[PDB]
Amino acid sequence: DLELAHEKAGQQLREAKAQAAEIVEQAKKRANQIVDEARDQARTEGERLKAQ
Amino acid sequence: AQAEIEQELNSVKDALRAQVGALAVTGAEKILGASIDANAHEQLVSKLAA
């Protein structure tokens, strides 16, 4: 039971580290798209203003 | 975008000052109306200037 308890304790930390990496990479993808959203909006308004 | 809009306007203002207005080099027609009396004044002016 002590060997099984150590294996469960080891699984818990490795699963937490895998979850942490997914949280950071999903936030990086949202961050990248936030800058693209602002760039496309700013370029669109620039073209509207100069055409007018 | 606003700097590019000012560059467009000043290119039009300069193109108008160059196409039209600079058309005043046709002042040669006014000057074409000159004669020997005026020529004598220009020769005196030229002589005073070496």
Resolution of the experimental model, in Å, one decimal = 2.8
How far apart are the C-alpha atoms of A49 and A40, rounded to whole Å? 14
Give first-to-last CA distance, chain B, whole Å: 56
Q: Is B49 exposed, middle or buried (0-12, 13-18, 19+ CB in 10 A)?
A: exposed
Three-state SS for B1?
Answer: coil
Q: Residue B12: exposed, middle, or buried by beta-carbon count in 10 A (0-12, 13-18, 19+)?
A: exposed
Best mutation site among A41, A43, A47, A50 for testing chain B: the one with the most B CBs within 10 Å? A50
Please name the residue of chain A whose CA is at the shortest distance from the CA of residue B9.
Answer: A50
Q: Are A50 and B5 in contact (CB under 8 A)?
A: yes
Distances in Å between the alpha carbon of B9 and those of A44, A52, B16, B18? 21, 13, 11, 14
Q: Provide the b/e sequence for A5-39 (b: ≥16 CB within 10 Å).
A: eeeeeeeeeeeeeeeeeeeeeeeeeeeeeeeeeee
According to the entry, how was the structure determined? cryo-EM
If interface means Cβ-Cβ distance under 8 Å, which residues of chain A face chain B? 45-46, 49-50
